[PDB]
Amino acid sequence: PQVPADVVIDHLSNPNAKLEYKVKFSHKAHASLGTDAAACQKCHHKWDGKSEIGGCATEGCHADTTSFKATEKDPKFLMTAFHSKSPMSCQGCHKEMKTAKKTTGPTACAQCHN
Ligand code: HEC
Ligand code: HEC
Ligand code: HEC
Ligand code: HEC
Ligand SMILES: [Ca+2]
């Protein structure tokens, strides 16, 4: 399927405004992960490899936007999908790849959020 242009991820609206973030994400920058269907499945992990690809926060997925904890572990929350220790999350993949210092994205909170 079509690989999107750069976006700003902004699904969450932390009532503590100092901890509200709008986070740039580039499919193109992530091309080193691959461009085949399996590459897409490294993140779109429930995708069947054939259908339309959609967002992470639909019904039955990571739809709950009411936890604002970076340490959230319940997968029903969107925070978990971007932060958990799993290699499918933003923070989790970058940090797992950093285990033997493979080239990867930002691991620090502020460097990723900007
Ligand atoms: C290091 C420990 C942290 C901490 C404390 C937080 N983050 Fe992140 N973050 C990332 C993405 C893609 C989002 C989604 C933004 C959105 O959809 O609006 C967030 C969001 C947050 C929040 C909520 C922000 C809000 O607008 O409500 C909070 C409180 C938060 N984070 C804390 C992405 C990343 C990273 C990318 C690799 C990394 C690293 C971090 N976050 C790290 C941290
Ligand atoms: C492999 C080549 C692909 C393809 C074909 C797509 N992706 Fe991704 N993608 C990722 C994240 C976190 C999002 C949501 C960002 C947000 O919440 O704004 C997306 C989004 C998409 C879309 C749009 C879906 C929608 O309607 O919102 C599409 C069409 C899409 N992707 C296709 C994250 C990743 C990855 C993590 C690094 C990787 C790898 C891929 N995507 C790979 C692919
Ligand atoms: C969009 C690209 C994403 C991203 C970044 C993540 N998901 Fe999912 N996810 C879903 C379910 C039911 C689970 C639980 C495990 C399972 O039953 O397979 C998960 C798991 C995750 C994790 C791990 C969370 C943890 O630390 O335990 C992560 C980091 C993650 N996902 C990220 C459900 C769905 C979907 C339903 C079809 C869709 C679509 C997505 N997730 C999309 C994404
Ligand atoms: C969840 C939506 C995210 C977000 C917000 C980011 N990442 Fe990744 N990332 C991965 C790798 C291997 C790289 C290095 C690519 C390379 O240089 O070859 C990156 C890079 C980034 C960046 C930096 C982009 C740039 O312009 O240099 C940023 C801002 C970033 N990421 C944010 C690997 C992964 C994953 C492996 C499965 C996962 C999941 C994510 N990244 C998820 C996210
Ligand atoms: Ca936000």
Envelope shape: globular
Q: What's the SSE pattern? A: EEHHHH
Strand arrangement within the widest β-sheet reads 1-2
Beginning-to-end CA distance, first to last residue: 29 Å
Strand content: 5-15%
Count the DSSP helices: 4
Number of domains: 1
Structural class: mainly alpha
Compute the number of strand runs: 2
* Estimated radius of gyration: 14 Å
What is the assigned CATH homologous superfamily?
A: Cytochrome C3
Describe the main β-sheet briefly: 2 strands, antiparallel
Describe the structure.
This protein has four helices and two strands, in the order ββαααα. It has 114 residues and is mostly helical. It has one domain (1-114): Cytochrome C3, CATH 3.90.10.10. The radius of gyration is 14 Å and the shape is globular.
